[PDB]
Structure formats: C-alpha cells, structure tokens
Amino acid sequence: NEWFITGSNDTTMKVWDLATGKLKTTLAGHVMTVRDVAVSDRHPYLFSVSEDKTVKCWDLEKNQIIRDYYGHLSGVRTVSIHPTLDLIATAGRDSVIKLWDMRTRIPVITLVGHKGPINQVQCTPVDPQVVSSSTDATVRLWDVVAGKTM
Amino acid sequence: LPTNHNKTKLLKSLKNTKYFQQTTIDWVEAGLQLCRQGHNMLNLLIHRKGLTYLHLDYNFNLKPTKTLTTKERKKSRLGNSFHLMRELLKMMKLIVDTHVQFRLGNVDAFQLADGIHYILNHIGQLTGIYRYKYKVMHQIRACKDLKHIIYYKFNKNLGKGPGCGFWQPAWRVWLNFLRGTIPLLERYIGNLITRQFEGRS
Amino acid sequence: ASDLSWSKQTDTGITHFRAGMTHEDEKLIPTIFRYITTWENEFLDSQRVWAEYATKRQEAIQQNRRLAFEELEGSWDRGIPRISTLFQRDRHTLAYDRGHRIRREFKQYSLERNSPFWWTNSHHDGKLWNLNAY
Amino acid sequence: SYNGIGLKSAKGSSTSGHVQRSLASIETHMEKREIEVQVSELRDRLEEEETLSEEQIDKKCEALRAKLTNEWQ
Amino acid sequence: FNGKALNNAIPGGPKFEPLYPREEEFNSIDRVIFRVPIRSEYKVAFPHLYNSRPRSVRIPWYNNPVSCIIQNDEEYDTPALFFDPSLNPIPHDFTLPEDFAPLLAEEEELIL
Amino acid sequence: IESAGFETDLRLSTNGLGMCQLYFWHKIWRKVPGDVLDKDAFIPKLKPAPINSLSRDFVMKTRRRKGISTGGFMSNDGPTLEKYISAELYAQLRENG
RNA sequence: AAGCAGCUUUACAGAUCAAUGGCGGAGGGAGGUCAACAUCAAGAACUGUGGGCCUUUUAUUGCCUAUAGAACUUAUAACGAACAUGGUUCUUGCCUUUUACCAGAACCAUCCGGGUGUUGUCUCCAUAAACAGGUAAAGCUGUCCGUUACUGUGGGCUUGCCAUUUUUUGG
Ligand SMILES: O=P(O)(O)O[C@H]1[C@H](OP(=O)(O)O)[C@@H](OP(=O)(O)O)[C@H](OP(=O)(O)O)[C@@H](OP(=O)(O)O)[C@H]1OP(=O)(O)O
C-alpha cells in the first residue's frame, strides 16, 4: 500500500502515492489507451492491458517492459492475474480469453464461448478459475483444465 | 555469458540419429560437396516456389533468365534470408574455388594465400552480402582495418603490391560473423521453410 | 573549436579547428563568405562613395553640367544603396515609392512562398552582392 | 574529445571530427628594544653567576635600566 | 573503459559516444588557478580527481614496478649472466673439513 | 600547484619506463615569484599566468573561492588600508613614502 | 653424505610347511575430434556426517559447534588469454516509411565453443582375477590366495655415533 498505479487514455500509466497523493513515476510504454492495469500479488510485476493489442509486463524492480504477450486478435480490455499460479488472463474485444504463461509468453489455454467483446475477467484460486463477463450479458464460469464453461 | 546447461549441440544431436553418417574425406571434397549441395538446396527453394526463370548460376548469382512481369517480380523477390544464404555460399564457393585452383595445379600456394586474403578482405566487393544484412559492414570494416594493419607490417621494406597472404585475422572475423548468424539463419530459414511446407499462419 | 567547458565562460581564442566536411581529396573548395563584402566594410565604403557622390553633385551644380554616369564608373557597384540605383530606367516612377521595406516584409503574412530576400529590394537598393567571381 | 576540445561524437555533426590545433595562437622603539636586550643580558649574567636571590638581580637590573634611560636623554 | 565513460579520447585509443548526455558559481574561471592545463590523459589516468562528476568509471590499473629487463641483443655472443653495457657500475684460526663443499659443487656450469 | 600529474607525464613521455613519486616530508616552502600587492600585474584567463605575476594570481583566485573578495574584478586584495590605516595621514604617508 | 647398529623392502638362502599378522589381490593399463548425466557467476562465495537451539506440536525455514573432504573458472575477477548475433525499452544519427541500419545504455537471451567429476562404450596393448549378500557406485564385508609374521647377504633412510660444572662414564 505504498502506491497505486492508474493507467490512463494519454497512454501514460502514473504511479501515485496513497498517503501523500504524489507522483513518483510514470510508466509510458504503450502507444494506445491503457485500458486495464493489474499489479501482481506474489510477483514484482505490473501487467498493463492497453488497446495496442499488447499485454505488457512491467518489472517493478526495474520499471521496464520485460514481456510482451502477442496473440490477441483485437483490442484487449482486461487483465486477471491468477493469484496462486503463474498465468495471467487477458481478454478483450475479440470475445476470447487468452490465458498466458508468464514464463514462455505462450497463449496456453484459449477460452472459447463468449459472443461479444469481453469486459471484465476475474480469476479465483479454485474452479471457476476464470469468472468472466462480456457484452452478450453472460457471466461465464470457466474450467481452465477442460476449456469449457462450467 | 554462455549458457551452462547447454548439453545439446547441433552435430552432436545429429550423430545420434540413423540418418547422418561419419566419414573422413578431403577438405576440398567437403567444400565442393557443400557447393554442390548448396546449389541444389537453393535451386530447390527457387523451384518449389515456381521461380523457374531465376537461373541461379553455379557461382550463386541469381539472375532472371528473361525480363519479368510484375507478378514474376513479386514472387521472385525474396527476403534477407534466402539472399543471405546465397551470399554466404558465394563467399564459401570463392574460398573453395581458390583452393581448387590450387589443387588443380594452376596457381601457386603463395598466390592461393594472396587470393584467399583477397577474398576475406573483399567480401563486400566480390560477393554482395552487405546488401541483405548491413551489420556485415562491421566485419567488413574490421576486415578492411585488418588489411590496413597487415599491409603496413608485411610491407615495411617492400613498398606497394600484391603478394600478402596472412589471412588469419580476417578469417577469424568472418568466422565470428558466422558464429553470430548461425542461429539468425536457423530462425529465418526455419520460418521460410515452414512457410513453404506448412504455410502461413 | 575551443574548450566547451571554457567556451561557455570566457571569450576563448580560436585554439583548435574541427574539420568541416572532409573529402578524401585535398580540394580547397572556395567559400561564399570570402566573396561577399562584410557589412562594416560596406558601410565605411558607403559613407566614402556617398561623400564622393554628394561632392561631385555639388560640383556639377557649380559647374552647371548634368552629371553623366560615365564618370562614376569604378564606384558604380559600391555603397549601400548602390550608385547604380541613381541611373536606373524607372527612377521617376520609384520617386513616389514609399513604405516599400515593410510592404516587402509583410508579404510573409499574405504569400505562401515569400522570397527569402524579404529585406532587400533591387529596385531601391540594387544588387548588394556579386558572386560571379565565386 | 581529447583535451576536452573535440565533439561528443563524430556521429551527429556529420563532420570528420578531425580537431587539429591552431597554428595561429621608530628610533624610540629601537632604543626600547635595545634596553630590553640589555636587561635580558643582565638577567642571564645574574643567573650564570651568584644570584639565587631575586633582590640582587632585580636591583642590578633596575640600575642598568636607569643607566640606559640616562643614556637615551 | 574510462575513455568511453568520460566521452574522452586517447591518442592511440578509440573514440565512442558519450555514455551520458551531460549538459550544464562554483567551478567558474573566477575561482580557478590555471597552472596545469588538464590534458585528458590526466582525466583517464586519475579519473576521480580530474573529473567533476564521473560515474560508471572503472578504477584504472596503476603502474607495475619498473621492469628492468636486459634484452641480450648481441648476435648470440654474450653469456646468459654478464654485466650489460646499460648497467651502471658499482662504485664501492677457524677451520673446516677440506671435503666441506658448497651446495651444487658437483657441477661447474653456472649456466647451460 | 604545478605538479598536477607530473607522474603520468613522466610515464607517458618515457612510454612507461619512468616512475615518479612526489612527496612532502621535508616540508619545504618556497616564495612564489611576483608580489602579492602587485595590482599592475597582468592576469590571463585561459593560458597560465606568467611567472612575475604568479602570486598576484595565486592570491586572487583563492580569495574568490573563500568569499573574501566581492567579484571577478582585479580589486579586493589584502591592503594595509582596509585593516587599520583609515585616517588619511597614515594612508598618504604609506603611499607617499 | 663412506661404515656399523636399528627400521623397512624386494631378489632371496632359511623354522613351521600349521593356527597367526602386515602388505598386496575378491574381473587390467594407455588412451579416443566417443556420448550420457551432473556441474560451471556466487554472503568469496561449496558440500558430507553428528549434536544442540527457536515456531504452537517440532513440519519445509534459520543458526552455534565438531571433524573429513572442495574437481573445474575466478582478480587488470572469470568457464573461452577469443568474441559474434538477436529481442524489448530509452536516447542519438541516416533520414523519405519499414525491413536492413548508425551506436550507446539497461534488462534479457540465442549461437561457435570450453573445463572438471562419474558412469558407459570403443580402439590398441597385455592377462586364487575363486565363492557368498547390495546399493545409484566401488575387495563394502564374510570365506579366501601370493611376498610373508622368527635370522643372514643384497638396496633405501625416518635415526644415533665415528669422563674432566649443565645430563651418558660419579657426591
Ligand atoms: O587507395 P589507397 O588509399 O591508396 O589504398 C589502397 C587500397 O586500400 P583501401 O581499400 O584502404 O582503399 C587497395 O585496396 P582495394 O583498392 O583493392 O580495395 C589496396 O590494394 P589491395 O586490397 O589489392 O591489397 C592497396 O594496398 P596495396 O596496393 O599496398 O596492396 C591500398 O594502397 P595503400 O597500401 O597505399 O593504402
């Protein structure tokens, strides 16, 4: 709780301070509107979905981009770091959640079944491990193993 | 720093199959066979795409047989990868052909060494690798720079003229270039050959 | 070139020379600044040649002769404005031209490609340089 | 930049960067001092030769001082 | 490494980009005694003294002792141990057994 | 003040064979040539000062470091007149003698 | 360091030809452009065994001590006394957009390679090594076999030597 980072439409995430309200740093690696920011719980990372079609990892021991998760078919809207594994859940306009292993930057498990663009994805440590929701008015609960909506 | 858990190598991973076989041949025969096989592989890369009018000469000069369409200039342009293969095989064929002109009895060993030192310090003139990969210019400059040292320590009491054939450090510079662009060409030609067989993702 | 830790402090003498555009040849290409007369060397000369012209005009009024321009040759291309303005073919028309400096200076607010010679006007000042010797 | 003269880089200026060196470049006071010196000398003498008691040396010194004063007007 | 990190040339040495773009009362000519013009060889030799604001500067190897190696360059004519022409000259009962020998008295040859 | 790297000068002139060791245990102190009170001494700015105007230099710049002077002009030395000679008779006798 | 005494050794002359006890043996040496597994960037930094001490139940952490070992690189720090290339981001150049680039940084990587240990295989040269239990591995152990445990010749040295106050020639 030393800080909170607010990604904004001027492409520049800014790291503000809780107790004082000060800037400390500005993270400006995107070129499009930064839509979602998700800081990791057990990693010193900062995953920043923008609509650059890029999911960028920010190493907070360095304040540098280290990983760029390519594979999205359109703009991305949300991150969801699975809190007790090493994968992130990114989904957006292309109506499909791509899970990403954080080491190998591979789309590990595609999650097929939402119709319209997906707005907000949440991950739980126990199945349903992806609680996602889209513009087709469906909150789908996902099986990460089977790849099917439970 | 090199990787420490690299137990895998390239040729050590190819001895352990049933397809490659160990033998002992002359170096000149190995060079002539890599020229023949490189000509066959680049000729088959050309001929799978349908570029049968690009008569890849035996000295690895890609020349169109006839003047082209634009459709026969779109399929017949190729990237830095295929041309980089073509230019390194031009370089290697110049090396092996000067050793052949030695081994045939035509040219002297001193004139072989000067011919090799001419090759390894005129790759940017004799071959054309500078076009398709421009950081080769680094090594080309280094080869020129080694020329500029060696011709004024070989020629203290000799003045100006051909005859210098101390080709060792320029040879090292081009081997270090090949050390750098083995995995580059592995990835480039792996992507090209999987576009030829598997196709575009 | 001079010491860029010292050059932002004092008027350093020109202690070094960085090479401008070196070619492999030793071609000493002449530069335009040597073929343009500098402003002090134009203005002292302008005061001299206009003192000479006002003296020759006072004498030609005293001699009651009209000052033909076969005498001022040699001083025909010296002085700001030029002596060659005084015997151009439209001097009676340009007698009534006033405010031409700012008219030529505010062309940049109404022309898309103004001439870069916004300041000079060869009808009123003449050619202030000659690069046919360059 | 040798001697801090040259460029940051030859790249950027589009020059050769060949930086070459240019071939174109009181009496009373004195008296007092003397008196003091004399006194010191006297004291030293006293110390040297039979003057463990102060009164003697002091007396002699005083006399010397007086003499000096007399000498200087 | 010091010549690279300090934007600084050596006569035999190579030139680089500046590693740091460095721009702009204390160190003005009003307060500087100009006796020794600080050549860049000082700034590479003693890099922390002659440089206001160095960083990423590796500590240079201060000298080895004075190697007084005799070169023996006379036509294979001199022995291995002799007094070289460049060497400066030097301006300065009890009994034992007869068979008490020095150590290595069995061999005569000082050199081989 | 003149040995700012005499050691590297002996090493780079002799191409590495020389060796210099500067030391100050026999604590010798020599007069700088030139007067302190020489206000008519010329002071260059980028080349080093000449010999007969050295000490006037070596005073002044150190004064500008320590704030006892009042700017980068040739005045503000240490005069007799600032310390005690304030009445005009002492000043005129010192300048008239 | 000539010799003698002593100790040890092999070639032995010898006592038993026993029960002993040392040493050596209970399936070799040199290697090879042979590969397989480890291992190689660090509190200057490593493990083996054993004890003891701390969690709220003694579990995975982390220390203090005792000894036996640390091969390989490492200080002008690094497996390599040599040196390429690629990715991301930032800052320059060329600029006419990108690839291809100029060239510096930071963080990462990818390639040519390399060392050491062990296992195995292969090549060349040789040749009481018998039986029984196991492990990831060995004479590891039990039975067992040669010189041989009690003298002398021949070699080696780990030693000593070649009475008059403080030791060994008398209170
Ligand atoms: O033109 P120059 O300035 O006189 O230099 C040339 C040139 O060297 P550069 O590549 O540096 O220009 C030649 O190289 P190429 O023309 O072949 O490219 C080289 O001849 P070789 O490469 O054939 O050896 C020759 O060297 P030399 O004639 O001594 O063999 C050398 O002349 P310099 O020795 O005077 O520099």
GROMACS .gro file of C-alpha atoms (C1' of nucleotides) in nm, chain B residues 1-4 6-7 9-10 12 15-16 22 80 131 133-135 138-139 141 172 176-177 179-180 182-184 187, chain G residues 33-41 79-80 82-87 99-103 109-115:
model
   58
  151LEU     CA    1   2.793  -1.533  -2.056
  152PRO     CA    2   2.731  -1.869  -2.226
  153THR     CA    3   2.452  -2.096  -2.111
  154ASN     CA    4   2.567  -2.355  -1.861
  156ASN     CA    5   2.369  -2.643  -2.294
  157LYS     CA    6   2.442  -3.012  -2.320
  159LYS     CA    7   2.485  -2.910  -2.961
  160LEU     CA    8   2.392  -2.926  -3.327
  162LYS     CA    9   2.609  -3.397  -3.150
  165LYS     CA   10   2.512  -3.814  -3.476
  166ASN     CA   11   2.253  -3.982  -3.253
  172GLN     CA   12   3.059  -4.039  -4.001
  230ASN     CA   13   1.714  -1.121  -4.646
  281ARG     CA   14   2.317  -0.558  -4.929
  283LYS     CA   15   2.250  -0.777  -4.397
  284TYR     CA   16   2.415  -0.448  -4.322
  285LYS     CA   17   2.589  -0.528  -3.991
  288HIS     CA   18   3.106  -0.404  -3.920
  289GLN     CA   19   3.301  -0.716  -4.006
  291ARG     CA   20   3.520  -0.260  -4.186
  322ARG     CA   21   3.867  -1.507  -3.769
  326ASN     CA   22   3.289  -1.479  -3.574
  327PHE     CA   23   3.028  -1.339  -3.812
  329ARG     CA   24   2.916  -1.764  -3.514
  330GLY     CA   25   2.670  -1.481  -3.484
  332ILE     CA   26   2.412  -1.942  -3.739
  333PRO     CA   27   2.101  -1.901  -3.514
  334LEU     CA   28   1.980  -1.599  -3.708
  337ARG     CA   29   1.530  -1.893  -3.734
  800U      C1'   30   3.773  -3.459  -3.275
  801C      C1'   31   3.336  -4.119  -2.824
  802A      C1'   32   2.834  -3.965  -2.588
  803A      C1'   33   2.543  -3.966  -2.140
  804C      C1'   34   2.437  -3.747  -1.674
  805A      C1'   35   2.561  -3.392  -1.337
  806U      C1'   36   2.828  -2.915  -1.267
  807C      C1'   37   3.033  -2.432  -1.403
  808A      C1'   38   2.869  -1.642  -1.164
  846C      C1'   39   3.420  -2.123  -1.785
  847G      C1'   40   3.676  -1.908  -2.398
  849A      C1'   41   3.880  -1.547  -2.821
  850C      C1'   42   3.441  -1.291  -2.936
  851A      C1'   43   2.972  -1.279  -3.267
  852U      C1'   44   2.425  -1.212  -3.312
  853G      C1'   45   1.912  -1.131  -3.183
  854G      C1'   46   1.473  -0.932  -2.880
  866U      C1'   47   1.297  -0.404  -4.312
  867A      C1'   48   1.806  -0.351  -4.344
  868C      C1'   49   2.057   0.030  -4.017
  869C      C1'   50   2.433   0.442  -3.722
  870A      C1'   51   2.580   0.339  -3.153
  876A      C1'   52   1.859  -1.402  -2.441
  877U      C1'   53   2.044  -1.707  -2.891
  878C      C1'   54   2.480  -1.929  -3.129
  879C      C1'   55   3.068  -2.122  -3.208
  880G      C1'   56   3.267  -2.339  -2.828
  881G      C1'   57   3.526  -2.499  -2.326
  882G      C1'   58   3.668  -2.711  -1.835
   0.00000   0.00000   0.00000
